[PDB]
Amino acid sequence: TLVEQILAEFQLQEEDLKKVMRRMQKEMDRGLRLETHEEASVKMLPTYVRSTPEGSEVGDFLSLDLGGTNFRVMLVKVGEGEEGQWSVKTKHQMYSIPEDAMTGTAEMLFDYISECISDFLDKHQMKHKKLPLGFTFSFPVRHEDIDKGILLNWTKGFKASGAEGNNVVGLLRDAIKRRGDFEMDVVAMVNDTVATMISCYYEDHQCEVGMIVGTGCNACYMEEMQNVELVEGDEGRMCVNTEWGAFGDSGELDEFLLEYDRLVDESSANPGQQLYEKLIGGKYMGELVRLVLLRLVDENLLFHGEASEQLRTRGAFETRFVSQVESDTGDRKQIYNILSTLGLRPSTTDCDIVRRACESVSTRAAHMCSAGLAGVINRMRESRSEDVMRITVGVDGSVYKLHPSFKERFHASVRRLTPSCEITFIESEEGSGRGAALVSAVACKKAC
Ligand SMILES: Cc1csc(NC(=O)c2cc(Sc3nncn3C)ccc2N)n1
Ligand SMILES: OC[C@H]1O[C@H](O)[C@H](O)[C@@H](O)[C@@H]1O
Numbered sequence: 001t002l003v004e005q006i007l008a009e010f011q012l013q014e015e016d017l018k019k020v021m022r023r024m025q026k027e028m029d030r031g032l033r034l035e036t037h038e039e040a041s042v043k044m045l046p047t048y049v050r051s052t053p054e055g056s057e058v059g060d061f062l063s064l065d066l067g068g069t070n071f072r073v074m075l076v077k078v079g080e081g082e083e084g085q086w087s088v089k090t091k092h093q094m095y096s097i098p099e100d101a102m103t104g105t106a107e108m109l110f111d112y113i114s115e116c117i118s119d120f121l122d123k124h125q126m127k128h129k130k131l132p133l134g135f136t137f138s139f140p141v142r143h144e145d146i147d148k149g150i151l152l153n154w155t156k157g158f159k160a161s162g163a164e165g166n167n168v169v170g171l172l173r174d175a176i177k178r179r180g181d182f183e184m185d186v187v188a189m190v191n192d193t194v195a196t197m198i199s200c201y202y203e204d205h206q207c208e209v210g211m212i213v214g215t216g217c218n219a220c221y222m223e224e225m226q227n228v229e230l231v232e233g234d235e236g237r238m239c240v241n242t243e244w245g246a247f248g249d250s251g252e253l254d255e256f257l258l259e260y261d262r263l264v265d266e267s268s269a270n271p272g273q274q275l276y277e278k279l280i281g282g283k284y285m286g287e288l289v290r291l292v293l294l295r296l297v298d299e300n301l302l303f304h305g306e307a308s309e310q311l312r313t314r315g316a317f318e319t320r321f322v323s324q325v326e327s328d329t330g331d332r333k334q335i336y337n338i339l340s341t342l343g344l345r346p347s348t349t350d351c352d353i354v355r356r357a358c359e360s361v362s363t364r365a366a367h368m369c370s371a372g373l374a375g376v377i378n379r380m381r382e383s384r385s386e387d388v389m390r391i392t393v394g395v396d397g398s399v400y401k402l403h404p405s406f407k408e409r410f411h412a413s414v415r416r417l418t419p420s421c422e423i424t425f426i427e428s429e430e431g432s433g434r435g436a437a438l439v440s441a442v443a444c445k446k447a448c
């Protein structure tokens with residue numbers, strides 16, 4: 001019966017979440033203040049995207065989406081909307097990064113990206129058009145401005161020599177010149193959390209928070225300028241990229257971490273970093289599951305103590321498997337097919353145990369995540385007057401969007417933790433592309 005008590009290790013009581021939430025708030029304040037911003041696990045990075053935008057330019061914009069291996073190039077059209085700009089994706093193409101240039105230097109990487117941009121401009125007879133480019137770039141960047149900032153480090157298993165520490169917008173502009181054909185006017189670079197927030201903002205002006213729960217996990221929110229000590233000026237408001245994925249990197253999370261968490265971290269491309277993200281993100285969820293499964297087969301609780309060759313190979317339990325397992329109608333068919341595909345022959349109870357393990361991980365993910373969002377929303381509550389703070393959160397990510405019950409658990413948990421708040425959740429259409437374009441269109445009012 002060792003089973004349910006092994007899975008019980010994943011539970012988090014209310015008071016646990018509240019604790020995580022209050023710590024998250026502590027680290028966010030720490031990241032915003034000059035004296036601690038340098039050492040803070042939660043970097044709270046200024047994005048230079050500011051409030052009261054208008055006016056905005058209109059017309060076609062080119063949008064780049066890297067974060068990464070399968071990155072997108074698309075063409076967004078922005079125009080004078082009702083109380084802001086409308087926008088829409090009119091053309092698009094995905095490109096797979098070759099694991100070769102992916103491993104090669106940064107200039108190799110951005111060369112391949114420059115090519116793909118030409119590939120795209122050809123296919124659509126735009127090669128000669130010279131457009132403003134919005135760059136969605138889903139990694140930690142310390143910005144000097146909206147069109148300048150350096151890669152702090154790669155996340156999410158990404159890596160490519162000689163990129164960290166360099167101006168990312170700089171690398172791209174270079175690679176474009178090392179091509180000859182087109183001239184792209186690189187206007188804005190934004191985190192995906194930000195682009196998503198921006199997309200949703202024109203749908204709902206109360207949306208002041210952007211959140212991604214896919215491969216990785218992160219959020220952004222509108223801060224009061226006087227709180228952004230790393231940008232000068234107490235007047236106005238600026239979006240901040242928390243990069244909360246790194247929360248826990250100074251040990252804020254030690255009392256919650258499980259063996260499976262330590263295994264996942266140690267064997268990761270970035271051991272010691274992004275620990276909070278590794279509790280939630282789809283880069284890691286399936287693998288947590290795999291490790292739990294293996295621990296069960298070792299206590300002879302599962303598959304009759306016999307793991308298959310595949311189940312023993314790192315990364316074999318894809319996050320989408322977790323999501324299919326929890327979609328099982330209860331005829332175990334879905335669960336059987338996955339497990340079989342992994343070289344296993346599950347009994348009826350094997351399947352039910354595996355479903356249990358999936359629910360335990362994805363439920364912990366949903367709650368861990370709800371603590372951070374609640375921490376952000378409750379921080380923002382401090383700066384609002386009305387009795388009930390009504391606020392909208394824009395969200396994107398496969399885990400949040402596609403996993404059968406993650407979002408329900410998440411919503412309920414966030415609400416428990418955020419009294420005197422009315423939270424509305426919006427999912428973003430093409431939040432990355434249209435988000436980057438919308439921001440470019442406003443940034444163009446000063447550089448175009
Ligand atoms: C310096 C600079 C460059 S681009 C820029 N502004 C934007 O792109 C932009 C910012 C927001 S943030 C905001 N304001 N009120 C509420 N919210 C969430 C909303 C829409 C936008 N198009 N500032
Ligand atoms: O893609 C979602 C998130 O993944 C990681 O946490 C990146 O560091 C962050 O910048 C990004 O927003």
Ligand code: NA
Nearest residue numbers: 225228231233
């Ligand atoms: Na300031």
